[PDB]
Design a protein around this ligand. Structure first.
Ligand SMILES: [Mg+2]
Ligand SMILES: [Mg+2]
Ligand SMILES: [Mg+2]
Ligand SMILES: [Mg+2]
Ligand SMILES: [Mg+2]
Ligand SMILES: [Mg+2]
Ligand SMILES: [Mg+2]
Ligand SMILES: [Mg+2]
Ligand SMILES: [Mg+2]
Ligand SMILES: [Mg+2]
Ligand SMILES: [Mg+2]
Ligand SMILES: [Mg+2]
Ligand SMILES: [Mg+2]
Ligand SMILES: [Mg+2]
Ligand SMILES: [Mg+2]
Ligand SMILES: [Mg+2]
Ligand SMILES: [Mg+2]
Ligand SMILES: [Mg+2]
Ligand SMILES: [Mg+2]
Ligand SMILES: [Mg+2]
Ligand SMILES: [Mg+2]
Ligand SMILES: [Mg+2]
Ligand SMILES: [Mg+2]
Ligand SMILES: [Mg+2]
Lengths: 49, 101, 194, 77, 328, 132, 257, 547, 138
RNA sequence: UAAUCGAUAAACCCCGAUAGACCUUACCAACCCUUGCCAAUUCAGCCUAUAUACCGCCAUCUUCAGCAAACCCUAAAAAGGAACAAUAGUAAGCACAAUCAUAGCACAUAAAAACGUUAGGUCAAGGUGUAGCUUAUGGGUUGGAAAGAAAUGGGCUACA
């Protein structure tokens, strides 16, 4: 059950016991991309708006 | 999440096959015999056809656990030929070594 | 604040007993091991790495808790649990005539959280037909009843039961099979006369 | 260790003919069910209660499908 | 690293005492053949390379020969050939040349006095003496060595040995000599055995191409072979296989003088024939003199056949046959 | 060129460990396996479960002890109890080290339904075998 | 999904493409901006998103003589802590984005005449603290190799001098610019000339020298004519200790000659 | 048990091995905090551990659920919640909102839950158990008497006992386990009536056809300790009566007697024999910790020997601990630390130095680290027998063991050197130890002036004046000046070494601060000047002194 | 010198049930390396000789399982990587064993079993005859 | 044809695939769902493009031996560094070799083969920088993914 492992690891990372370098790198890259100006479009406005 | 949507579908197929294992076995017991009259065998075929598609054990695919690779996997370790090599070359698998003879 | 404590080597006594420091299996901590051992492939101008920080010494299973002195000390305490084997069965010739029945039972151990092994249910029964009260007709009927399970060169009947889930159930079923095979070999029915 | 199979013995597994009383003795139902009983007896992966479920399911199915067994030309109960 | 080795020596002594105490043997009688045995038991590392296994020896074997100090506190070098790069090899060469000159002048004086008391002490063929190898010389001299200088040293040693040897020169030149092992290839002859009032009974073993054959030979019976309970004629329909059986007996002219019983397993017809031929040849050594057993071994009867099928390689067909290589 | 489990040689200044300095073809010749269990024998079973547990342990411990781990872990499986041996740099105080080991000894036990032992060896720095 | 993750070392090695095959022969140099950021710089192992204060990681183990139970920060405290963490990110980015201007010995984009610092001390322990050195010429030298092809190696001319009349020059060639600088500095001190300076400000007499293909005409000047010479001869004379000189270079203007 | 090995609970790595008792306690506390934090996550997220892989299905590692199964049914919603404080209080209100009838068994658990955990809320709950339902007194007193005792309200127990005896219901053995305490704890100028009430209750206990267990005889001795120190006759009579019925007295039973004997032994030492001859009979059998109040038994039975300075009895009381269970008799680490320190306090000066050192290496680094008190006794053990070879060995361990107490034990650790003689073979031990103590205080911590007088004589017989002279300059610049005895002693060493250049610098700084023996120093320097032929400088310093 | 006293507190009872008898006890220990098996065999024989069991030791032939995988990732079948798994067996034979002696031997054997090896135990239980075959006539 | 993709000179062509009736399958046509696997996240998810941004894995030179840090020298130095009766060369290290495995040696095989060349293959084992989708380039169900005018590579069967 990959869901159990993923949820447990994420919960531990948020609580402050596990440090996930891959997720931290993903968050850093997402932060830099959003600061640059190309972020995640909101649902319901990508095509129409 | 899981590795892939294909793996997420395959685990559901395995769960459905586990749920419908006994019923399919009982129905096939009525089809794989010659003692019973052929009249009820057609009704049994209709009943087994009325079963959900993902209930038969023929839809399961032995993918890799780590990378969900549909082919190139070993049944003993449930791992693809590449993940197996990656783990074995680091010495993380006991008794596994390069063959030299 | 950083602190560096010297290991037990400077404090280990020369005549101090070894099993006291290694009573059970241990990960071979170099601080409690006074023996300077170098393990690893040496360099051309170098020497094999010392015990400190050596992963090679940690990889292998250590037998420091199974030194001969510790083995003797442990077995001295274990002598109280065992019973004395009767001398009346020193040779197998008397064992055959006293206990003709042989029960082969398989046991397996493997590292892991699970214990069930499908080969544990197998129980084998071996009975020498030369130690039974079979008559000529009973023996001739039993040989054909069992078929290939009984050999002629050694004259030992073998029962291979694996139907029962439990090992005790398999043993009881083997005993029942032996009982019925012995009993029904004496019954002569109407179809035997033809 | 830790598994007792509900305290059953070899006679709760090998012998299952006592559950075939509610079936025709001379019809093809006996011929069909003796094979499934033999299979269950040699099956070590199922429990005695689990085999009861299979045989009861067969009893229920045969007793539910009454028109087909009558139309087959062979009398069955 | 002078103090480091000294500390390691004390640590090794303490560890040896502790190992003896924990193993239960007397530390006074504890030696290396017990140290390695106890190490192999306490740390059973299963590795194919012997040098990778745990080892606890004296530091002088583990650490290499460390170069001694060359100069004092004032900086003046000790040896007078320090600035020559190789103060050990060049000092040895200088001493050898000085001894050669001393031998030459002493021999000239002896010839002037018309006296001959020296003998030829250079022929060491029966002893089996050889010259030092480059590694052996690098063991004696801590500094590294080359090939040309080693050749020069050997050619000077032979020049020195070619002259009338002195009293102190022979012992100096002998320390550069090494003994060679016995090069005798003579095999061991099994003694004749007498089992169950049976005279002239011998046994031999042979292997060829995954075929193991054990042959017992009786020297008092007639000439016949019993293989696997059946006669050789029935067991080997092919004449070449029976010629394999005839090959050893015909070489010794013992066709009708020995009775042989063989048990051979594995391999095919030819492999079994070769295995039984080898076993019979090895077994017949006891019934023959030492002159003809050497003739058999020179004819190829007492030697094994290492020709074994090679393992198939990946990407190939028969370990040699490559796939059809298309140029374009 | 073979590149599996092989650290490329730099100009001659990078520090490497004994395990890293040996190519994978030297396994069982010059270096041993990082994990030992009975699942990889001939007539045994349950090998995939052991492998997935081992890889989960690797990934969990890497995040549990970030930046202070010296080399790969040693996972010994011996009669239903699992021993985990690690080499850790002495960067964290023992007060935090004991907290982490006490946390792990119970978390892994309750997650894998088996007793676990955790052993740590503190090193001043990563041990260098080849050129540094 | 958890088993699909890798380590930060491999993630950065793949993202930066430092060992890429296109940057080997010279196809790169288009975007020369390589920066690797350590994500474990200011992350406390006890801190988390939910704000739990563990007794062994975040808060001290014993407070007021008793044991501390598992506690959680308030929303305002968590906002304050995350605001401080965010402020640290921009504080580090401020230092990272700032680049100190390089030395302009002769021009803003050259290494001629720039200061390189005192040379490294010798093996015996002699330290050259009064010695100052300057770079006269930096040139990228290429060589044709059988396998790689062009082999770029930097050759640097470096001149040392103490200002008391002792000075020298050397050439250091190496694959890396810093290695060439170090080799030139460590080799210049071995070749030192002594220059006789009249009154320690000028030369004794005018000299007209004809080198391989370079003609140098230097004339003695009084105290008021300070170093009206070539842009490299002025640096060399400043290192030597000459304060007044007029020099004209005719013919080839090769730096080494 | 191993001698040079740390306890198994701590990690064997030296960087994780605790150094002091506080560090040992802190490491275990931190590890237990991590274990509790992990269990908190396990309980808060059960779904991440519901999958079971072990075949035997061990229940100890399964997550625990804090939520009650049934919420709508009032009857079924109370049993789940009582076993798991504040939430249990609302269960009674929720059940009573629907006017649900509560039986005599459901309310007993609710009352016990309040009694175990938890002033006016207690009365508000007590009125609800009595006025609402006619509950059985057996379920009444077990809560009321055990709850009102901790609330300093013992008057209700006596009132409830009258109703209990009137209801024709016998009182269990547990009722008198608290009634005697409730009666005894209140003392208003009288003790005989309070003690007679206990006697009347004990007499009624046998009439009620209920055998009093060991707890009644343990609690009467608990009550007889705080009030009267001369009430040993009833305690001994009850101890004798305990042996008559046939039940062995527990460890706490002897502990209570020993506490009062320790109280009464200060004025008269004749009671110590009764302390000594009672443990001999109890040491001959193997005991088991069947009473939770047995932790103080050894704490009180060894403190008497420690105070009375007995070692043959300390050996026996330690053998009693080591006979049955070496660890299941001490609960907290504070008691173990206070035990071992005063246990080793007697093994130093009484027995020989060899056995003292033999016991030193298996108790100090192995079991637990001493306090500042044992360090003084260890120093007192050395100077009496003139043991100087082991001084550095004790000192190097003291750096890690009593580092916190170093500032208060350093003035005493160095004083022993002034009483013994310094052999010529003991120069390095006096040099390295003196260097290691001077290298730390001047780099950062009051520095006593007595250590300078010791280091002056340490180098006096060693012939090392160069290193001895430089240390005096470090102290004379610290704005503190020692007595002139050290100056006079070092003048002899300077005269022996023929260094007139030292005393001239010494006196010119010593006489400037008005030392009481400056006249003696000025007389002593003239003696060395004549033999050193320094008459030219003899008057040179006289002129400076005059000016 | 601080040796605790009365440290031996066993609980051994002799039940009236007859003890189980065993004819032959075969212990087949399988592992990856040979040094571990040799050390384990030495330990086992040293333990057995003290108890007086007359253990017999022989080495069954090893088994090597080899397989082949692709060397590259996407497309390279001409080049392969072959992996090998060695399994070495050690056989310990015990004869004339009792139910309690076998139990106490297996206690000291299995508790100290190395992590890298497994063990198969085969017992030859001894019985005289079942009750229904002593002297029955149908 | 509505019906994948990549490889496609040595180094592709029974190659990814040690493997396709549904699933596999990323292809197409018909139909449904859009904070849509996870505790949460103006978030998930993309087999979308870029192998000319990569890591991980390999191919070829390749059973060729060279690569290379620190130095030193040249009547300047782009670069080179050798004469054994020796003329400026010392050189850690990686390669080669040795060792290891095919349960005894020797041989053979196996294994190994550095630095780099081919911007060689692989975004489709897996993650990924950059650029693009969010009631769709995302997620599910059913049914179809032919056929050979023709050419060619590799194998089996034979032509006795
Ligand atoms: Mg994916
Ligand atoms: Mg072929
Ligand atoms: Mg500019
Ligand atoms: Mg120009
Ligand atoms: Mg295609
Ligand atoms: Mg294409
Ligand atoms: Mg190509
Ligand atoms: Mg479909
Ligand atoms: Mg399809
Ligand atoms: Mg898609
Ligand atoms: Mg490319
Ligand atoms: Mg070469
Ligand atoms: Mg050059
Ligand atoms: Mg080199
Ligand atoms: Mg070999
Ligand atoms: Mg070879
Ligand atoms: Mg090859
Ligand atoms: Mg090689
Ligand atoms: Mg390309
Ligand atoms: Mg391509
Ligand atoms: Mg991708
Ligand atoms: Mg693509
Ligand atoms: Mg074709
Ligand atoms: Mg092909």
């Amino acid at each position: 059950n990959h869901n159990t492992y993923f949820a447990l690891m994420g919960t531990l990372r948020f609580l402050g016991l596990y440090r996930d370098e891959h997720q931290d790198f993903r968050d850093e890259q997402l932060r830099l991309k959003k600061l640059r100006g190309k972020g995640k479009p909101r649902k319901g406005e990508g095509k129409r708006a | 999440y899981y590795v892939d949507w294909k793996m997420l579908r395959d685990v559901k197929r395995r769960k459905m096959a586990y749920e419908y294992a006994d019923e399919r076995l009982r129905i096939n017991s009525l089809r794989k015999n010659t003692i019973l009259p052929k009249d009820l065998q057609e009704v049994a075929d209709e009943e087994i056809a009325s079963l959900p598609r993902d209930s038969c054990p023929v839809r399961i695919r032995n993918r890799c656990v780590m990378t969900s690779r549909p082919r190139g996997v070993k049944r003993r370790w449930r791992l693809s030929r590449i993940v197996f090599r990656h783990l074995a070359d680091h010495g993380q698998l006991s008794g596994v070594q390069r063959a030299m003879w | 604040r950083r602190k560096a404590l010297p290991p037990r080597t400077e404090k280990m006594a020369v005549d101090q007993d070894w099993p006291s420091v290694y009573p059970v299996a241990a990960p071979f901590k170099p601080s409690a091991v006074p023996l300077p051992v170098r393990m690893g492939y040496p360099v051309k101008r170098g020497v094999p790495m010392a015990k400190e920080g050596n992963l090679e010494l940690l990889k292998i299973p250590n037998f420091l808790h199974l030194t001969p002195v510790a083995i003797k000390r442990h077995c001295e305490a274990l002598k109280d649990f065992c019973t004395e084997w009767p001398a009346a069965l020193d040779s197998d010739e008397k064992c055959e005539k006293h206990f003709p029945i042989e029960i082969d039972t398989a046991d397996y151990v493997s590292a892991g959280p699970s214990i069930r092994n499908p080969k544990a249910r197998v129980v084998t029964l071996r009975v020498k037909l030369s130690s039974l009260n079979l008559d000529d007709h009973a023996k001739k009927k039993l040989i054909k009843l069992v078929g290939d399970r009984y050999c002629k060169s050694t004259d030992v009947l073998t029962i291979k039961t694996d139907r029962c889930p439990l090992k005790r159930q398999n043993y009881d079923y083997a005993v029942y099979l032996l009982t019925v095979l012995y009993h029904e070999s004496w019954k002569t029915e109407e179809w035997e006369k033809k | 260790a830790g598994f007792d199979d509900d305290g059953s013995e070899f006679h709760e597994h090998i012998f299952l003919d006592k559950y075939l009383q509610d079936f025709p003795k001379q019809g093809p139902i006996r011929h069909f069910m003796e094979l499934v009983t033999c299979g269950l007896s040699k099956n070590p992966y199922l429990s005695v209660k689990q085999k009861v479920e299979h045989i009861e399911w067969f009893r229920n199915y045969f007793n539910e499908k009454r028109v087909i067994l009558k139309e087959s030309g062979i009398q069955l109960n | 690293t002078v103090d480091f080795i000294k500390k390691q020596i004390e640590e090794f002594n303490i560890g040896k005492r502790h190992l003896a105490n924990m193993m239960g043997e007397d530390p006074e009688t504890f030696t290396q053949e017990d140290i390695d045995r106890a190490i192999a038991y306490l740390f059973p590392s299963g590795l194919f390379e012997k040098r990778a296994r745990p080892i606890m020896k004296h530091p002088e074997e583990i650490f290499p020969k460390q170069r001694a100090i060359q100069w004092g506190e004032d900086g003046r070098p000790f040896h007078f050939l320090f600035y020559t790069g190789k103060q050990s090899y060049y000092s040895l060469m200088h001493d050898t040349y000085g001894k050669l000159l001393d031998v030459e002048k002493h021999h000239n004086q002896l010839r002037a006095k018309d006296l001959l008391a020296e003998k030829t002490k250079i022929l060491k063929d029966p002893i089996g003496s050889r010259w030092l190898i480059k590694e052996e010389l690098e063991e004696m001299l801590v500094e590294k060595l080359s090939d040309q200088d080693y050749a020069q040293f050997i050619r000077l040693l032979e020049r020195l040995s070619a002259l009338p040897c002195g009293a102190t020169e022979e012992d100096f030149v002998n320390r550069f000599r090494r003994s060679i092992p016995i090069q005798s290839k003579k095999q061991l002859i099994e003694p004749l055995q007498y089992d169950e009032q049976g005279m002239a009974f011998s046994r031999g073993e042979g292997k060829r191409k995954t075929a193991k054959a054990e042959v017992v030979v009786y020297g008092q019976g007639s000439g016949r072979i019993d293989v696997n309970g059946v006669d050789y004629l029935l067991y080997f329909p092919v004449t070449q296989d029976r010629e394999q059986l005839m090959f050893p007996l015909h070489f010794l002219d013992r066709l009708g003088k020995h009775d042989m019983t063989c048990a051979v397993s594995g391999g095919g017809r030819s492999a079994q024939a070769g295995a039984v031929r080898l076993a019979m040849a090895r077994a017949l050594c006891s019934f023959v003199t030492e002159d003809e057993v050497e003739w058999m071994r020179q004819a190829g009867l007492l030697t094994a056949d290492p020709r074994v099928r090679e393992r198939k390689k990946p990407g190939q067909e028969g370990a040699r046959r490559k796939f059809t290589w298309k140029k374009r | 060129k073979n590149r599996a489990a092989r650290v490329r040689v730099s100009k001659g200044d990078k520090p490497v460990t004994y395990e890293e300095a040996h190519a994978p073809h030297y396994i069982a010749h010059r270096k041993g396996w990082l994990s030992l269990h009975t699942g990889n024998l001939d007539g045994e079973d349950h090998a995939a479960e052991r492998t997935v547990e081992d890889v989960f342990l690797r990934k969990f411990m890497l995040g549990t002890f970030p930046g202070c781990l010296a080399d790969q872990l040693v996972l010994k499986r011996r009669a239903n109890q699992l021993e985990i041996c690690a080499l850790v740099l002495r960067q964290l105080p023992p007060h935090k080290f004991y907290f982490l080991v006490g946390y792990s000894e119970t978390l892994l036990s309750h997650f894998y339904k088996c007793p676990v032992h955790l052993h740590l060896q503190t090193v001043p720095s990563k041990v260098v075998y080849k050129y540094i | 999904s958890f088993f699909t993750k890798l380590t930060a070392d491999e993630l950065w090695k793949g993202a930066l493409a430092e060992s890429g095959a296109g940057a080997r022969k010279g196809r790169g140099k288009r975007t020369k901006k390589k920066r690797r950021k350590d994500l474990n710089r200011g992350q406390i192992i006890g801190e988390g998103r939910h704000g739990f204060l563990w007794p062994g990681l975040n808060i001290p183990l014993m407070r007021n003589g008793a044991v501390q139970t598992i506690a959680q920060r308030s929303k305002e405290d968590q906002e304050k802590v995350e605001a401080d963490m965010v402020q640290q990110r921009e504080e580090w980015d401020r230092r990272r984005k700032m680049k100190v201007k390089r030395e302009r010995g002769w021009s803003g984009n050259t290494w001629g005449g720039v200061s390189l610092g005192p040379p490294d001390p010798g093996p015996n322990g002699e330290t050259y603290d009064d010695f100052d050195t300057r770079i006269l010429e930096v040139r990228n030298v290429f060589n044709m190799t059988a396998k790689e092809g062009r082999k770029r190696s930097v050759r640097v001319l470096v001149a040392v001098g103490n200002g008391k009349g002792a000075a020298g020059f050397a050439i250091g060639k190496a694959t890396e610019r810093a290695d060439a600088f170090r080799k030139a500095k460590n080799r210049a001190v071995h070749y030192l000339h002594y220059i006789e300076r009249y009154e320690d400000h000028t030369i004794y007499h005018d000299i007209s020298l004809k080198f391989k293909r370079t003609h140098i005409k230097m004339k003695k000047q009084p105290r008021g004519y300070g170093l009206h010479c070539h842009r490299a001869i002025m640096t060399i004379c400043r290192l030597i200790g000459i304060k007044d000189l007029y020099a004209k270079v005719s013919g080839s203007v090769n730096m080494l000659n | 048990r191993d001698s040079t090995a740390a306890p198994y609970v701590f990690q064997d790595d030296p960087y994780l091995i605790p150094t002091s008792s506080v560090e040992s306690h802190s490491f275990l506390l931190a590890k237990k905090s991590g274990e509790n934090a992990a269990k908190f996550i396990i309980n808060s997220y059960p779904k991440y551990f519901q999958k079971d892989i072990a075949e035997p299905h061990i229940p100890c590692l399964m997550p625990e659920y804090f939520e009650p199964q049934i919420e709508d049914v009032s009857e079924a919603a109370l049993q789940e919640r009582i076993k798991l404080x504040x939430x249990x209080x609302x269960x009674x209100x929720x059940x009573x909102x629907x006017x649900x009838x509560x039986x005599x068994x459901x309310x007993x658990x609710x009352x016990x839950x309040x009694x175990x955990x938890x002033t006016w809320r207690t009365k508000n709950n007590a009125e609800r158990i009595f006025a609402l339902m006619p509950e059985k007194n057996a379920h009444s007193y077990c809560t009321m008497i055990r709850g009102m005792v901790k609330h300093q309200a013992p008057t209700q127990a006596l009132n409830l006992y009258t109703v209990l005896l009137n209801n024709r219901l016998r009182a269990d053995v547990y009722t008198f386990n608290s009634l005697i305490e409730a009666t005894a704890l209140v003392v208003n100028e009288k003790f005989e009536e309070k003690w007679n009430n206990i006697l009347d209750l004990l007499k009624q206990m046998v009439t009620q056809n209920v055998k009093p267990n060991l707890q009644t005889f343990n609690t009467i001795l608990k009550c007889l300790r705080r009030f009267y120190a001369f009430g040993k006759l009833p305690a001994l009579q009850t101890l004798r009566e305990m042996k008559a019925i046939g039940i062995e007295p527990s460890l706490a039973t002897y502990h209570y007697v020993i506490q009062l004997f320790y109280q009464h032994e200060s004025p008269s030492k004749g009671s110590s024999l009764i302390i000594y001859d009672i443990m001999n009979e109890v040491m001959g059998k193997r005991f088991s910790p069947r009473d939770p109040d047995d932790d103080m038994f050894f704490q009180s039975a060894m403190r008497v020997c420690s105070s009375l300075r007995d070692l043959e009895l300390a050996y026996q009381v330690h053998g009693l601990l080591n006979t049955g269970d070496n660890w299941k008799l001490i609960g907290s680490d504070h008691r173990r630390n206070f035990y071992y320190s005063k246990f080793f306090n007697l093994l130093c000066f009484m027995e020989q130095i060899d056995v003292t050192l033999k016991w030193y290496k298996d108790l100090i680094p192995s079991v637990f680290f001493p306090h500042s008190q044992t360090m003084i006794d260890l120093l007192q053990a050395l100077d009496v027998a003139n043991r100087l070879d082991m001084v550095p060995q004790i000192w190097k361990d003291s750096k890690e063991y009593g580092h916190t107490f170093r500032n208060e034990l350093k003035e005493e650790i160095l004083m022993l050197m002034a009483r013994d003689q310094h052999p010529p073979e003991l120069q390095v031990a006096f040099a390295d130890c003196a260097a290691d103590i001077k290298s730390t205080y001047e780099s950062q911590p009051e520095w006593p002036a007595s250590s300078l007088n010791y280091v002056a004589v340490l180098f006096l017989r060693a012939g090392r004046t160069q290193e001895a002279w430089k240390m005096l300059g470090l102290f004379r610049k610290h704005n503190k000046i020692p007595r002139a005895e050290l100056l006079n002693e070092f003048l002899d060493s300077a005269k022996a070494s023929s260094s007139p250049a030292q005393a001239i610098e010494l006196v010119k700084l010593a006489s400037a601060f008005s030392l009481p023996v400056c006249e003696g120093l000025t007389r002593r320097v003239m003696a060395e000047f004549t033999l050193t032929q320094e008459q030219r400088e003899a008057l040179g310093e006289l002129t400076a002194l005059t000016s | 010198v601080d040796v605790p006293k009365d440290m031996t507190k066993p609980e051994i009872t002799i039940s009236d049930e007859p003890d189980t008898l065993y004819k032959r006890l075969s212990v087949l220990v399988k592992g990856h390396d040979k040094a571990v098996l040799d050390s384990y065999e030495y330990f086992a024989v040293l333990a057995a000789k003290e108890l007086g069991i007359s253990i017999k030791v022989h080495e069954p032939p090893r088994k090597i399982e080899r397989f082949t995988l692709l060397k590259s990732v996407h497309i390279f079948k001409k080049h392969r990587v072959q992996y090998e798994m060695r399994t070495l067996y050690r056989c310990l034979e015990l004869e004339h064993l009792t139910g309690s002696t076998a139990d106490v031997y297996l206690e000291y054997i299995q508790r100290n079993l190395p992590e890298g090896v497994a063990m198969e135990v085969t017992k030859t239980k001894l019985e005289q005859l079942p009750e229904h075959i002593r002297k029955p006539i149908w």
